[PDB]
CSV table of all heavy atoms in Angstrom, one decimal:
chain,number,residue,atom,x,y,z
B,89,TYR,N,-21.4,-12.6,-1.4
B,89,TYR,CA,-21.3,-14.0,-1.7
B,89,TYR,C,-21.5,-14.9,-0.6
B,89,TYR,O,-22.3,-15.9,-0.7
B,89,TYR,CB,-19.9,-14.2,-2.4
B,89,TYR,CG,-19.6,-15.7,-2.4
B,89,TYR,CD1,-20.4,-16.6,-3.2
B,89,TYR,CD2,-18.6,-16.2,-1.7
B,89,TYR,CE1,-20.1,-17.9,-3.2
B,89,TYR,CE2,-18.3,-17.6,-1.7
B,89,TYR,CZ,-19.1,-18.4,-2.5
B,89,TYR,OH,-18.8,-19.8,-2.4
B,138,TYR,N,-13.8,-12.5,-7.8
B,138,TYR,CA,-14.2,-13.8,-7.7
B,138,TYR,C,-15.6,-13.9,-7.0
B,138,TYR,O,-16.5,-14.6,-7.4
B,138,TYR,CB,-13.2,-14.7,-7.1
B,138,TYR,CG,-13.8,-16.0,-6.5
B,138,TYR,CD1,-13.9,-17.2,-7.3
B,138,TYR,CD2,-14.1,-16.1,-5.2
B,138,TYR,CE1,-14.4,-18.4,-6.8
B,138,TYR,CE2,-14.7,-17.3,-4.6
B,138,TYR,CZ,-14.8,-18.4,-5.4
B,138,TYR,OH,-15.2,-19.6,-4.9
B,142,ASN,N,-19.4,-14.8,-8.4
B,142,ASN,CA,-20.1,-15.9,-7.8
B,142,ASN,C,-21.5,-15.5,-7.3
B,142,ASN,O,-22.4,-16.2,-7.4
B,142,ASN,CB,-19.2,-16.5,-6.7
B,142,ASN,CG,-18.6,-17.8,-7.1
B,142,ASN,OD1,-18.5,-18.2,-8.3
B,142,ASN,ND2,-18.1,-18.6,-6.1
B,189,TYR,N,-6.8,-19.5,-9.1
B,189,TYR,CA,-8.2,-20.0,-8.9
B,189,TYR,C,-9.2,-19.0,-9.2
B,189,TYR,O,-10.2,-19.2,-9.9
B,189,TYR,CB,-8.4,-20.6,-7.5
B,189,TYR,CG,-9.8,-20.9,-7.2
B,189,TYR,CD1,-10.5,-21.9,-7.9
B,189,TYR,CD2,-10.5,-20.2,-6.2
B,189,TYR,CE1,-11.8,-22.2,-7.6
B,189,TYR,CE2,-11.8,-20.5,-5.9
B,189,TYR,CZ,-12.5,-21.5,-6.6
B,189,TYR,OH,-13.8,-21.7,-6.3
B,190,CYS,N,-9.0,-17.8,-8.6
B,190,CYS,CA,-10.0,-16.7,-8.9
B,190,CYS,C,-10.2,-16.4,-10.4
B,190,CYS,O,-11.3,-16.2,-10.8
B,190,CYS,CB,-9.5,-15.4,-8.2
B,190,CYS,SG,-9.7,-15.4,-6.3
B,192,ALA,N,-9.3,-18.4,-13.0
B,192,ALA,CA,-9.8,-19.6,-13.7
B,192,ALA,C,-11.3,-19.7,-13.5
B,192,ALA,O,-12.1,-20.2,-14.3
B,192,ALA,CB,-9.1,-20.9,-13.3
B,193,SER,N,-11.8,-19.4,-12.3
B,193,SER,CA,-13.2,-19.4,-11.9
B,193,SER,C,-14.0,-18.4,-12.7
B,193,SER,O,-15.0,-18.8,-13.3
B,193,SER,CB,-13.3,-19.2,-10.4
B,193,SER,OG,-14.7,-19.2,-10.1
B,194,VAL,N,-13.6,-17.2,-12.6
B,194,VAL,CA,-14.4,-16.1,-13.3
B,194,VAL,C,-14.3,-16.2,-14.8
B,194,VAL,O,-15.3,-16.0,-15.6
B,194,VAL,CB,-14.0,-14.7,-12.9
B,194,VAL,CG1,-14.2,-14.5,-11.4
B,194,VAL,CG2,-12.6,-14.4,-13.3
B,196,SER,N,-13.8,-18.9,-16.6
B,196,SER,CA,-14.6,-20.1,-17.1
B,196,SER,C,-16.1,-19.8,-17.1
B,196,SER,O,-16.8,-20.2,-18.0
B,196,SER,CB,-14.2,-21.4,-16.4
B,196,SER,OG,-14.5,-21.2,-15.0
B,197,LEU,N,-16.6,-19.3,-16.0
B,197,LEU,CA,-18.0,-19.0,-15.8
B,197,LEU,C,-18.5,-18.0,-16.8
B,197,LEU,O,-19.6,-18.1,-17.3
B,197,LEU,CB,-18.3,-18.5,-14.4
B,197,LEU,CG,-18.2,-19.5,-13.2
B,197,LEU,CD1,-18.4,-18.7,-11.9
B,197,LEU,CD2,-19.3,-20.5,-13.4
B,237,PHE,N,-7.0,-26.2,-2.1
B,237,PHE,CA,-8.3,-26.3,-2.7
B,237,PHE,C,-8.2,-25.4,-4.0
B,237,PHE,O,-8.6,-25.8,-5.1
B,237,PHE,CB,-9.4,-25.7,-1.8
B,237,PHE,CG,-10.7,-25.5,-2.6
B,237,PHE,CD1,-11.6,-26.6,-2.7
B,237,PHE,CD2,-11.0,-24.3,-3.3
B,237,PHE,CE1,-12.7,-26.4,-3.5
B,237,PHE,CE2,-12.1,-24.2,-4.1
B,237,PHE,CZ,-13.0,-25.3,-4.2
B,238,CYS,N,-7.7,-24.2,-3.8
B,238,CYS,CA,-7.6,-23.2,-4.9
B,238,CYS,C,-6.7,-23.9,-6.1
B,238,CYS,O,-7.1,-23.7,-7.2
B,238,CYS,CB,-6.9,-21.9,-4.5
B,238,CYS,SG,-8.0,-20.8,-3.5
B,239,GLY,N,-5.6,-24.5,-5.7
B,239,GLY,CA,-4.8,-25.1,-6.7
B,239,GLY,C,-5.5,-26.2,-7.5
B,239,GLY,O,-5.5,-26.2,-8.7
B,240,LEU,N,-6.0,-27.2,-6.8
B,240,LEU,CA,-6.7,-28.3,-7.5
B,240,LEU,C,-7.9,-27.9,-8.3
B,240,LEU,O,-8.1,-28.3,-9.4
B,240,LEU,CB,-7.1,-29.4,-6.5
B,240,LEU,CG,-7.7,-30.7,-7.1
B,240,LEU,CD1,-6.8,-31.3,-8.2
B,240,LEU,CD2,-8.0,-31.7,-6.0
B,241,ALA,N,-8.7,-27.0,-7.6
B,241,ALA,CA,-9.9,-26.5,-8.3
B,241,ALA,C,-9.6,-25.8,-9.6
B,241,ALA,O,-10.2,-26.0,-10.6
B,241,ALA,CB,-10.7,-25.6,-7.4
B,242,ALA,N,-8.5,-25.0,-9.6
B,242,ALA,CA,-8.1,-24.3,-10.8
B,242,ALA,C,-7.6,-25.3,-11.8
B,242,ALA,O,-7.9,-25.1,-13.0
B,242,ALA,CB,-7.0,-23.3,-10.5
B,243,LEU,N,-6.9,-26.3,-11.4
B,243,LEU,CA,-6.5,-27.3,-12.4
B,243,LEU,C,-7.6,-28.1,-13.0
B,243,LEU,O,-7.5,-28.5,-14.1
B,243,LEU,CB,-5.5,-28.3,-11.7
B,243,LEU,CG,-4.1,-27.7,-11.4
B,243,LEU,CD1,-3.2,-28.7,-10.7
B,243,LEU,CD2,-3.4,-27.3,-12.7
B,244,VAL,N,-8.7,-28.3,-12.2
B,244,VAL,CA,-9.8,-29.1,-12.7
B,244,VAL,C,-10.5,-28.2,-13.8
B,244,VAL,O,-11.0,-28.8,-14.8
B,244,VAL,CB,-10.8,-29.4,-11.6
B,244,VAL,CG1,-12.2,-29.8,-12.2
B,244,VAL,CG2,-10.3,-30.5,-10.6
B,245,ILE,N,-10.6,-26.9,-13.6
B,245,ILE,CA,-11.2,-26.0,-14.5
B,245,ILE,C,-10.4,-26.0,-15.8
B,245,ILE,O,-10.9,-26.0,-16.9
B,245,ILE,CB,-11.2,-24.6,-14.0
B,245,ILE,CG1,-12.2,-24.4,-12.8
B,245,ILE,CG2,-11.5,-23.6,-15.1
B,245,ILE,CD1,-12.2,-23.1,-12.2
B,246,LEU,N,-9.0,-26.1,-15.7
B,246,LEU,CA,-8.2,-26.1,-16.8
B,246,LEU,C,-8.0,-27.5,-17.4
B,246,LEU,O,-7.3,-27.7,-18.4
B,246,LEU,CB,-6.8,-25.5,-16.5
B,246,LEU,CG,-6.8,-24.1,-15.9
B,246,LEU,CD1,-5.4,-23.6,-15.5
B,246,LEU,CD2,-7.4,-23.1,-17.0
B,247,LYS,N,-8.5,-28.5,-16.7
B,247,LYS,CA,-8.4,-29.9,-17.1
B,247,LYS,C,-7.0,-30.4,-17.1
B,247,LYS,O,-6.5,-31.2,-17.9
B,247,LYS,CB,-9.0,-30.0,-18.5
B,247,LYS,CG,-10.5,-29.5,-18.5
B,247,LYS,CD,-11.1,-29.6,-19.9
B,247,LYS,CE,-12.5,-29.1,-19.9
B,247,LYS,NZ,-13.2,-29.2,-21.2
B,249,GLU,N,-5.5,-31.5,-14.1
B,249,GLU,CA,-5.3,-32.1,-12.8
B,249,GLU,C,-4.1,-33.1,-12.8
B,249,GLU,O,-3.4,-33.3,-11.8
B,249,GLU,CB,-6.5,-32.8,-12.1
B,249,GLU,CG,-7.9,-32.4,-12.5
B,249,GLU,CD,-8.3,-32.6,-13.9
B,249,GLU,OE1,-7.8,-31.8,-14.8
B,249,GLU,OE2,-9.1,-33.4,-14.2
B,286,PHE,N,-15.0,-27.0,4.2
B,286,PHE,CA,-15.1,-26.9,2.8
B,286,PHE,C,-13.8,-27.0,2.0
B,286,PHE,O,-13.6,-27.8,1.2
B,286,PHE,CB,-15.8,-25.6,2.4
B,286,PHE,CG,-15.8,-25.4,0.9
B,286,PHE,CD1,-16.7,-26.1,0.1
B,286,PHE,CD2,-14.9,-24.6,0.2
B,286,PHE,CE1,-16.7,-26.0,-1.3
B,286,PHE,CE2,-14.9,-24.5,-1.2
B,286,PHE,CZ,-15.8,-25.3,-1.9
B,287,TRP,N,-12.8,-26.1,2.4
B,287,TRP,CA,-11.5,-26.0,1.8
B,287,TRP,C,-10.8,-27.4,1.7
B,287,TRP,O,-10.3,-27.7,0.7
B,287,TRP,CB,-10.6,-25.0,2.5
B,287,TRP,CG,-11.2,-23.6,2.5
B,287,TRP,CD1,-11.4,-22.9,3.7
B,287,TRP,CD2,-11.5,-22.7,1.4
B,287,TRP,NE1,-11.9,-21.6,3.3
B,287,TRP,CE2,-12.0,-21.5,2.0
B,287,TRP,CE3,-11.5,-22.9,0.0
B,287,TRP,CZ2,-12.4,-20.5,1.2
B,287,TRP,CZ3,-11.9,-21.8,-0.8
B,287,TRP,CH2,-12.3,-20.6,-0.2
B,290,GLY,N,-13.7,-30.4,0.6
B,290,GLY,CA,-14.1,-30.1,-0.7
B,290,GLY,C,-13.1,-30.7,-1.7
B,290,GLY,O,-13.4,-30.9,-2.9
B,291,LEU,N,-11.9,-31.0,-1.3
B,291,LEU,CA,-10.9,-31.6,-2.1
B,291,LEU,C,-11.2,-33.1,-2.5
B,291,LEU,O,-10.8,-33.5,-3.5
B,291,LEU,CB,-9.5,-31.6,-1.4
B,291,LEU,CG,-8.8,-30.2,-1.4
B,291,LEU,CD1,-7.6,-30.3,-0.4
B,291,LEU,CD2,-8.3,-29.9,-2.8
B,293,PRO,N,-14.2,-34.5,-3.3
B,293,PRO,CA,-15.0,-34.6,-4.5
B,293,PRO,C,-14.2,-34.3,-5.8
B,293,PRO,O,-14.2,-35.0,-6.8
B,293,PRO,CB,-16.1,-33.6,-4.3
B,293,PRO,CG,-16.2,-33.6,-2.8
B,293,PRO,CD,-14.8,-33.6,-2.3
B,294,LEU,N,-13.3,-33.3,-5.7
B,294,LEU,CA,-12.5,-32.9,-6.8
B,294,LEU,C,-11.5,-34.1,-7.2
B,294,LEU,O,-11.3,-34.4,-8.4
B,294,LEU,CB,-11.7,-31.7,-6.5
B,294,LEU,CG,-12.5,-30.4,-6.3
B,294,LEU,CD1,-11.6,-29.2,-6.0
B,294,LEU,CD2,-13.3,-30.1,-7.6
B,295,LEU,N,-11.0,-34.7,-6.2
B,295,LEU,CA,-10.1,-35.8,-6.4
B,295,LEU,C,-10.8,-37.1,-6.9
B,295,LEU,O,-10.3,-37.8,-7.7
B,295,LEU,CB,-9.4,-36.2,-5.1
B,295,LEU,CG,-8.1,-35.3,-4.7
B,295,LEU,CD1,-7.8,-35.6,-3.2
B,295,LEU,CD2,-7.0,-35.7,-5.6
B,297,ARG,N,-13.4,-37.1,-8.8
B,297,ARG,CA,-13.7,-36.8,-10.2
B,297,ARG,C,-12.4,-37.0,-11.0
B,297,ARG,O,-12.5,-37.6,-12.1
B,297,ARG,CB,-14.2,-35.4,-10.3
B,297,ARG,CG,-14.1,-34.7,-11.7
B,297,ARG,CD,-14.6,-33.3,-11.7
B,297,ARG,NE,-14.6,-32.6,-13.0
B,297,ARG,CZ,-15.1,-31.4,-13.2
B,297,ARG,NH1,-15.8,-30.8,-12.3
B,297,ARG,NH2,-15.0,-30.9,-14.4
B,298,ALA,N,-11.3,-36.5,-10.5
B,298,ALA,CA,-10.1,-36.6,-11.3
B,298,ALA,C,-9.6,-38.1,-11.4
B,298,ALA,O,-9.2,-38.5,-12.5
B,298,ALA,CB,-9.0,-35.8,-10.6
B,349,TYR,N,-18.9,-21.2,4.8
B,349,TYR,CA,-18.1,-22.4,4.6
B,349,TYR,C,-18.4,-23.6,5.5
B,349,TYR,O,-18.2,-24.8,5.1
B,349,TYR,CB,-16.6,-22.1,4.7
B,349,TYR,CG,-16.2,-21.2,3.5
B,349,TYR,CD1,-16.0,-19.9,3.7
B,349,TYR,CD2,-16.1,-21.8,2.2
B,349,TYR,CE1,-15.7,-19.0,2.6
B,349,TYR,CE2,-15.8,-21.0,1.1
B,349,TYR,CZ,-15.6,-19.6,1.3
B,349,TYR,OH,-15.4,-18.8,0.2
B,356,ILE,N,-21.4,-30.7,1.3
B,356,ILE,CA,-20.5,-31.6,0.7
B,356,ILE,C,-20.5,-32.9,1.4
B,356,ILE,O,-20.5,-34.0,0.8
B,356,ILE,CB,-19.0,-31.1,0.7
B,356,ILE,CG1,-18.9,-30.0,-0.4
B,356,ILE,CG2,-18.0,-32.2,0.4
B,356,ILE,CD1,-17.5,-29.4,-0.6
B,381,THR,N,-23.8,-28.3,-3.4
B,381,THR,CA,-22.9,-27.2,-3.8
B,381,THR,C,-21.9,-27.8,-4.8
B,381,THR,O,-21.5,-28.9,-4.6
B,381,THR,CB,-22.2,-26.5,-2.6
B,381,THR,OG1,-21.6,-25.3,-3.1
B,381,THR,CG2,-21.2,-27.4,-2.0
B,382,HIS,N,-21.5,-27.0,-5.8
B,382,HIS,CA,-20.5,-27.5,-6.8
B,382,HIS,C,-19.2,-27.4,-6.2
B,382,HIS,O,-18.7,-26.3,-5.7
B,382,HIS,CB,-20.6,-26.6,-8.0
B,382,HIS,CG,-19.9,-27.2,-9.2
B,382,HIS,ND1,-18.6,-27.2,-9.3
B,382,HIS,CD2,-20.4,-27.8,-10.3
B,382,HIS,CE1,-18.2,-27.7,-10.5
B,382,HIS,NE2,-19.3,-28.2,-11.1
B,383,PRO,N,-18.4,-28.5,-6.1
B,383,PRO,CA,-17.1,-28.5,-5.5
B,383,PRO,C,-16.0,-27.6,-6.1
B,383,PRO,O,-15.1,-27.2,-5.4
B,383,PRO,CB,-16.7,-30.0,-5.6
B,383,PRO,CG,-17.5,-30.5,-6.8
B,383,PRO,CD,-18.8,-29.8,-6.7
B,384,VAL,N,-16.2,-27.2,-7.4
B,384,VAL,CA,-15.2,-26.3,-8.0
B,384,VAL,C,-15.4,-24.8,-7.7
B,384,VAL,O,-14.5,-24.1,-7.3
B,384,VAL,CB,-15.1,-26.5,-9.5
B,384,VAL,CG1,-14.3,-25.3,-10.1
B,384,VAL,CG2,-14.5,-27.8,-9.9
B,385,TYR,N,-16.7,-24.4,-7.9
B,385,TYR,CA,-17.1,-23.0,-7.7
B,385,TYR,C,-17.7,-22.7,-6.4
B,385,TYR,O,-17.6,-21.5,-5.9
B,385,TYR,CB,-18.1,-22.6,-8.8
B,385,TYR,CG,-17.5,-22.8,-10.2
B,385,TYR,CD1,-17.9,-23.9,-11.0
B,385,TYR,CD2,-16.6,-21.8,-10.8
B,385,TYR,CE1,-17.3,-24.1,-12.3
B,385,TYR,CE2,-16.1,-22.0,-12.0
B,385,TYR,CZ,-16.5,-23.2,-12.8
B,385,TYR,OH,-15.9,-23.3,-14.0
B,386,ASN,N,-18.2,-23.7,-5.7
B,386,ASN,CA,-18.9,-23.5,-4.4
B,386,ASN,C,-20.1,-22.6,-4.5
B,386,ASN,O,-20.2,-21.6,-3.8
B,386,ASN,CB,-17.9,-23.0,-3.3
B,386,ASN,CG,-18.5,-23.1,-1.9
B,386,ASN,OD1,-19.3,-24.0,-1.7
B,386,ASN,ND2,-18.1,-22.3,-1.0
B,387,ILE,N,-21.0,-22.9,-5.5
B,387,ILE,CA,-22.2,-22.2,-5.7
B,387,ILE,C,-23.1,-23.4,-6.2
B,387,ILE,O,-22.5,-24.4,-6.6
B,387,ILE,CB,-22.2,-21.1,-6.8
B,387,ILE,CG1,-22.0,-21.7,-8.1
B,387,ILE,CG2,-21.2,-20.0,-6.4
B,387,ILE,CD1,-22.1,-20.6,-9.2
B,388,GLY,N,-24.4,-23.3,-6.1
B,388,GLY,CA,-25.2,-24.4,-6.6
B,388,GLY,C,-24.9,-24.9,-7.9
B,388,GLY,O,-24.6,-24.2,-8.8
B,389,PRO,N,-24.9,-26.3,-8.1
B,389,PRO,CA,-24.6,-26.9,-9.4
B,389,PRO,C,-25.4,-26.4,-10.5
B,389,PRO,O,-25.0,-26.2,-11.6
B,389,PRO,CB,-24.8,-28.4,-9.1
B,389,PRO,CG,-24.5,-28.5,-7.7
B,389,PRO,CD,-25.1,-27.3,-7.1
B,392,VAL,N,-24.2,-23.1,-11.7
B,392,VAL,CA,-23.0,-23.2,-12.6
B,392,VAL,C,-23.4,-23.5,-14.0
B,392,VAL,O,-23.0,-22.8,-14.9
B,392,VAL,CB,-22.1,-24.4,-12.1
B,392,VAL,CG1,-21.0,-24.6,-13.1
B,392,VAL,CG2,-21.5,-24.0,-10.7
B,396,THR,N,-22.9,-20.9,-17.1
B,396,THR,CA,-22.0,-21.2,-18.2
B,396,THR,C,-22.8,-21.3,-19.4
B,396,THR,O,-22.4,-20.8,-20.5
B,396,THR,CB,-21.3,-22.6,-17.9
B,396,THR,OG1,-22.2,-23.7,-17.8
B,396,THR,CG2,-20.5,-22.5,-16.6
Side-chain angles (χ1 to χ4, degrees):
Chain B
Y89 166 64
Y138 160 85
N142 254 16
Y189 168 65
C190 287
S193 175
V194 302
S196 57
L197 288 174
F237 172 86
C238 288
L240 183 56
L243 286 179
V244 166
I245 291 177
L246 302 177
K247 308 180 180 180
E249 334 63 289
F286 177 75
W287 303 121
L291 283 170
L294 294 179
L295 278 166
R297 161 180 180 173
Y349 295 103
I356 286 184
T381 192
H382 195 284
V384 167
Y385 303 99
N386 194 30
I387 67 174
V392 173
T396 64

